[PDB]
Amino acid sequence: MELVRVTEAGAMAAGRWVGRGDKEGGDGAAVDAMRELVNSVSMRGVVVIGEGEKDHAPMLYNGEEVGNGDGPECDFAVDPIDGTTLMSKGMTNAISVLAVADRGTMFDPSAVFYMNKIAVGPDAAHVLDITAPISENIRAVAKVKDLSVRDMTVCILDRPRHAQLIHDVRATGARIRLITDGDVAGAISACRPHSGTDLLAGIGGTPEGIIAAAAIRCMGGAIQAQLAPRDDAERRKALEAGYDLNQVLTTEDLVSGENVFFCATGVTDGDLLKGVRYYPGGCTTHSIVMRSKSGTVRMIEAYHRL
């Protein structure tokens, strides 16, 4: 069960590219570290969600059989650096995340879409309805959490596509914690108690949403998702090919295993994880590790030497 090391390795390599302005270098260092370390853990695993396909993205592709070959079969999802932008620009909130579940329990690869997603902590889990307007979701979650609607804090990615959403949430008088990248940590923060974030809502990336669903399954809470295309061209494509885009995906629908493992390691100083500190002896790396069987969330600061 050497899994944590992976993300830690991912951060460590990636940590040496912070502020440097090169994004591909950080992604590549993190991917190389995580690959070289995961192919050594006694674990046969298929990457259902990763960097990409077997063409331009050479490393950490979908369908890659990772591990030394031993152990039980399992679905594997990895974001080497969530918010690579923030890594290269030397800004806060950047992590290396990894989710592991039973074989076949993670959400469909299928075709490459974005994902509209809305998540809340265990408090108001059963009252989410992603098809309802954000007004009703905010009001329901507010009453359930015993909050006034003015003190609700919705986390939304600061994009042009979400502008309307912004306005709507601002109509209910609710606060919006606009972030720039990384809705995995944002969803985990929404499902974190006393974290300031009560709810996440927005159209982010499907891999991030599936890994966040694994995390939410581990720690408790609920995320609902609808697939979404980037342009009208892909909406049309989904129409000829029979994609029920109106379909709602739950937390279990994305990751439906029984043992669910989610570990992140901070690259830069994030809200839920401190970045990698380098000193001549080695480096300190902070990580979070969550298991579904036990519900024990473990926050681990690790000291490394050479």
Ligand X SMILES: O=P(O)(O)OC[C@H]1O[C@](O)(COP(=O)(O)O)[C@@H](O)[C@@H]1O
User: Binding site for substrate, residues?
Assistant: 82-84, 114, 159-161, 181-183, 205
Among 121, 182, 221, 270, interactor with ligand X by CB under 6 A:
182
CB of 183 to ligand X, least distance (A): 4
Cα 84 to Cα 59, 97, 142, 209: the distances in Å are: 16, 12, 33, 17
Tokens describing residue 143: 């009453």
CB of 145 to ligand X, least distance (A): 25
Which residues contribute to the annotated binding site for Mn(2+)?
27, 51, 79, 82, 208
CB of 269 to ligand X, least distance (A): 16
205 counts as binding ligand X under rule CB under 6 A:
yes
195 counts as binding ligand X under rule CB under 6 A:
no
Of the ranges 57-65, 180-188, 253-261, 290-298, which one interacts with ligand X (CB under 6 A)?
A: 180-188
Q: Could you tell me which of 83, 105, 103 has the C-alpha nearest to residue 92? A: 83
Which residues contribute to the annotated binding site?
27, 51, 79, 82-84, 114, 159-161, 181-183, 205, 208
157 versus 222: smaller Cβ distance to ligand X: 157
CB of 25 to ligand X, least distance (A): 13
85 versus 195: smaller Cβ distance to ligand X: 85
Among 8, 51, 64, 181, interactor with ligand X by CB under 6 A:
181
Give the footprint of ligand X on residues 84-113 (CB under 6 A): 84-85
159 counts as binding ligand X under rule CB under 6 A:
yes
CA distance 217 to 260: 7
Phi-psi domain of 194 (left: phi exceeds 0; alpha: psi -120 through 50; beta: other): left
Cα 295 to Cα 47, 101, 215, 289: the distances in Å are: 24, 15, 11, 10
Q: Could you tell me which of 210, 232, 226 has the C-alpha nearest to residue 97? A: 210
Phi-psi domain of 71 (left: phi exceeds 0; alpha: psi -120 through 50; beta: other): left
Among 208, 215, 219, 283, interactor with ligand X by CB under 6 A:
208
Tokens describing residue 46: 């298929």
172 versus 206: smaller Cβ distance to ligand X: 206
Residue nearest to ligand X (CB): 204
Cα 174 to Cα 3, 117, 139, 182, 303: the distances in Å are: 39, 18, 10, 21, 41
CB of 196 to ligand X, least distance (A): 18
28 counts as binding ligand X under rule CB under 6 A:
no
CB of 144 to ligand X, least distance (A): 26
Residues that bind ligand X (CB under 6 A): 82-85, 157, 159, 181-183, 204-205, 208
